[model samples]
Target: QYVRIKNWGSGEILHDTLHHKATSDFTSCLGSIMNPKSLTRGPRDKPTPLEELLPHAIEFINQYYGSFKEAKIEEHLARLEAVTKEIETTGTYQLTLDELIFATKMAWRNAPRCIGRIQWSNLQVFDARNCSTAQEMFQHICRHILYATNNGNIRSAITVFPQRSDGKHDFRLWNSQLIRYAGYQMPDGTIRGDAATLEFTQLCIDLGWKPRYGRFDVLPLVLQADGQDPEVFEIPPDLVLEVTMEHPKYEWFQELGLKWYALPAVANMLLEVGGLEFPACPFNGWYMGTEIGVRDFCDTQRYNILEEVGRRMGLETHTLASLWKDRAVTEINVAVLHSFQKQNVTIMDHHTASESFMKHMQNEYRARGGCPADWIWLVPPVSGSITPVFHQEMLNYVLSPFYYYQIEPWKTHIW
Candidate 1:
């Protein structure tokens, strides 16, 4: 039944436009707001039903906090699950990349509205069939989101592409291709549409800078006139999806004598190349402001960047990444550990920082060919089984480059 309200000079009145109370044999059970009755059937209880418990728990959490935005909720639950699993186990939780992906999916589903507000009406649609490659899909999605969030509310389009690897074509790449194609504009005043995203096919090409992914280099370069500062390239806010990697190539860049920084441009490249199967880009891209596996590895750097940017824009940094690996924990106890300590470089503990420590432990169990129960029983309790306070702290420590960068006070002296 739908209810509508209207007000007159005399008073306000309520109207039930589509009332169906007469069609049912049951009576209305309306009562106090505190004890409102459910119209639908309730869930049945089963043994060890964590999934069943999720909705109810989330309801209470949302009620207390007043919002259940999806992006933030996923990150929150991931942290809770990790912390809970850690408390059950003694310390760190070993997890595989695939397991982390699964947990992220579940976290999103369970808490779809617990974070920032992103209305579906805000998204522009597109055909998934046109995106034949991962790059094309990414371009399409990015461009669509950009248009939707901005003034150009455009309809989604499709494009086709040739096959890679086995020579047999696949549709899985369509999603990412959408984003890429949407934003694609070439130097020759040509719009490649679907085919344009494939320009990044050259993985071995060295363009001076550490060979970043090919697709990431797809953006058209704007010419700068003399006396004018280099054209400032900014990813459209809606089109910007943050990307991070469990294993960052920054260390590799350092070995190659490149100054690696987490600027927006570099981060966009990470998103463009990350999680792509074809031509197999090594980075992982996520929907902007959404929680994913990258948080564990790159949250520290990501958060600091967000903080700085937010500060400039006068916005608060609501989301953050956490680090909680065994090595990270050891570093917290003592500023240095092992041979690398002499060099003053500490590895970020992306494993336990953002996701639920308990969940992470459960994942570790799977990695060692053991069951969740076995690992949960062995893990230790910390941060009340799943709070996010400590995780943020870890992210701050890892992302700070004072000790790692050579341009600061540490530049004059070598460790």
Candidate 2:
């Protein structure tokens, strides 16, 4: 059979291969794409064909808008044609405001790895396509942070900048998120802060950002545009909402001085709308407790606080049979959920999050006849068996519009 791969660097290429061979090769390639196996994993290893991506977007648009608006089939086709031509000639495409909003929501809806799609339709999209400078991008990011933080009542939001045009002049955010802790490797073989932000922390320092020795120092925003030298901007501390973690039963837990930002604003992922890729779109949602309590604070490579907490709890930590680690993790998670709720900061426990996800799946089934999900991601990290999502079967597939992993800006100069 003949197979054509579209949306390669320059243009599409047609190949002749046996049907079985083509299917096998594509399956292997897709399987090789990165799963969120670890905290710091990068984007997918390969880009999906635009030909395969666009049809999904168009179908979604039609299904979503057909009931409310006039068919506008001819108009939609014309817009698609124009976008194709623009991408072919300029390596970028422009989306209308309505299309931008729909695409942003659809991106969340099509995120198979996210269990929070029940709130997909409510995502607020900030259109910053006109932004052409690093400083301008920084300002828009600040606005997104302020609006989404909502003074602790966090809201989901995405701010999209200009796309890569003609393989040049791409806007890229160097920070992993709008807000993250600075990680400083100490001389005594201990880390001062979050180990995840070590690489970015160094990049910011190299760009003339002064480092604070404290564990919770906010990293400066690093941004680059038009293939220029990156610029660093300090995010105002007032715009960031951090929850101080304290346990209801243990006063010592408060003395540990643990805290985390209320929102998880992802900045490194690429936003693919239709067939065009915007590499500098930063988005956020309210945090899930385990994302902080279990992974960020307790992961071996992260804070590695299990042993310390276990020691404080007076549990045996020398052996696995004692389940001291498990006891410590439960208290840690409990403290996180308690702290966020006490502060009136929007957060969800894993059990409630799993329930919401199941409801979202049922809603999607009724509306679209099927729902796509990643079972591994849908199940919470702490308690796997108790949640309804744990027993549910799920399938993951690539659909546009979607958020995709992109190569880190500091690691690549392709843009």
Candidate 3:
């Protein structure tokens, strides 16, 4: 018999003919082909059963917090089991205020992609679980920014909105971050501003948002609840803390007029606690200088200012051998660090951040006997070898009560 298989990537349909004798081994062969060991490295792709995951979660909690007695552990396990069963039956479960806070902190601690887990225990989880309306969601988001920014003191915080309980009502934020630059596509097929935000920028404009053709325009919040029509709300200027980019040595750098917000609140990631998912959890941490300096400012898809910086510095831009781009990028990063420091903003340098990550790893090892880390993300965007994280071997695995990427709400809906 012949079976048809579709290749989604190439949009090609192919026929597979099985041998008559191979029919007995078809199930095992298909299983081996589908579940390749190399691809299934983490729990994200192949999730462990809820029954199994709860025990592991309980064990970690017991080990990390030594005060939990056997009875208390059993009690906590009972609650988890009840919640798991509720979710399985009704497609939803409600976490108590204490449970919500603990889950948020555990999410940060269990995040394998984050190297800044040293302050995991210090996370402030705001219980906004009751907010279901779009207006209420926007107001809570504003409050989150105000509290997290804290006039440049930058507290690591997460404001968790309600989760999808009935399988019909889901809340989602369209913006990638609480604060991001508006990317304007020019008529000549070139971007006038940050190219990364072009899609969201157009969405905002189409939804009647007034665009001020400036380099550093703050984007309004676009949110949808219960699959309803998405609403837009402008964040007040007073609540945002922005730093204008200027180099102490290069006076010409200021003429370019670059600036960024101090807070990096990511608003689109899904926060999973046990088996339940909260799709509208926005979280923030203090900035690491390279995030803005190297990737956002220097990437070809972003600002692409390296060549401009090179021309300003009188470096040869015609030849890749000149290494002008590299030199300009280094200087731009230096300027970012200097500008942030001059403003007294809390920004961690790659060297110091890498060292801090090592300390985090050591602390986690001492407490939990293992640390889950992604080395590719742990290393800085630039100067990877110079940092200590480059030499270290890391194991990456998805754990419960961790942040995970989800599908964008706009992708599913017709505007």
Candidate 4:
């Protein structure tokens, strides 16, 4: 599969293979958490047994104990033995609150592609491990939304649901994210709202979510508990925080009537810790400006507003050589940054985020052997070279206590 093709004509050959690695980055960087390929691994089909669990569980236990300054072998070994006995008795074990907190933080720290890892330690972990039903899960989800929304000061947080034991009774989030606009196919065949969510939008509709059938209509949450058929619950509007985009320089920008949600919580990723997996853990971080401005607003696939915005700016959209799209996107990014600030919503410009990540990388290098990084994902979608991460030589590797992508619930669902 790593076959290299030779270019005989224009003198480009080896570069093609190298470029293949960057193709996924285009979509992955569209938002913090959008693409399926952005995931590290698929869900495990078989339940982990004592043979598989003991070694990894003990290794993570060792790491947890080693994190503190002083060594406490007695406590460490005692807890290790307790875990073994629990697994022997129940066929599965649970993480202590201390270990769960440590594990979630480590998972975020070990995430290779997240530029927001600089703020990893600040995550507010809400343990929903005791939750068993869809209703309980929704209550937990709503609390996380309100806590994380935090009136647009947007705090970083995660809600960890019951861990997956038997593959058949897994907890899952059917939606891509906790908050998103629905996509509806019009009778004329044009898509309204987020074009990216068209399929999931239809699925939600079929699952009894009433279609609002308008642009920027917030979608309902589809929560599946214990592998049960998914249930749709509408997120409270009061709990949601949105920023309306406007340009201070160009008052006409408000006339465009654009609005975006402040929260960018990725709702469906699995949390892996000490060989235990929580399939429905949703986590969030504040957005980088260009995540909304460049990829969300300007990407041809998502909203496809580049041409219209270019025309609105009176740029020469008829000619690509004029770099009209470039000019228009910068203003839109400015609008995003400016609007978020005016509304008191937390956001980072690409420049600040890039600088912060580089600092974190420097710290991580000495702390760990190396900080895992994906260069393509680290660099901003637009203005790639302008950011510091673009010039750095970065490595990508998977570490334990990490987040993993699972197969979409719809695919694996029998009910």
TM-score ranking from best candidate downward: 4, 2, 3, 1
* lDDT (Cα, tens digit) per residue for candidate 2, span 1-415: 4544443223456563554454433322332224333222243334445566456545544644563456777776676676667545644456788888888888788888888999998989899988988889888999999999998899999998886554456788888778989989988988988876777788888889999877889899888875687888999988888999999999999999999988799988887765567878899988999999999899866777889999999999898999998899999999999999999999999999999999999999898777778786788878898999999987777676778776676776642
lDDT per residue as tens, model 1, 68-173: 3344666556655754464245222222333223322222222211111112112122333234433454464455444432322222221112211221222222
**Which candidate order results from sorting by lDDT in descending order?**
4, 2, 3, 1
The predicted structure with the larger lDDT, 3 or 4, is 4
**Candidate 3 similarity to native, TM-score:** 0.82
Runs of candidate 1 exceeding 4 Å displacement: 1-124, 130-139, 145-167, 172-415
Pairs with steric clashes in candidate 3: 107-401
lDDT of 2: 0.80
Highest TM-score scorer: 4
Task: Name model 4 segments beyond 4 Å from true.
Answer: 1-40, 43-46
Model 1 residue 200 CA deviation in Å? 13
TM-scores, each model vs. reference: 0.21, 0.84, 0.82, 0.91
Candidate 3 residue spans exceeding 4 A from truth: 1-91
Predicted candidate 3 versus true structure: per-residue lDDT over 1-415, tens digit per residue = 6655655334477777743446444322332132234222121323345565455545444433433444575566676577667645754457777767888887888887687899998988888888879999989999999999888888999998887554356778889899887989877877777877888899999999998876778899999875577899999999999888998899999898988899998998887764566778999999998999998898877888888999999999999999988898888988889998888888888899999999999989998788878786788888999999999988777676677776666766554
For model 3, the run of ten residues with the poorest summed lDDT: 38-47
Regarding lDDT, does 1 or 4 come out ahead?
4
Query: What local lDDT score does residue 187 receive in model 2, on the 0 to 100 scale?
Result: 85
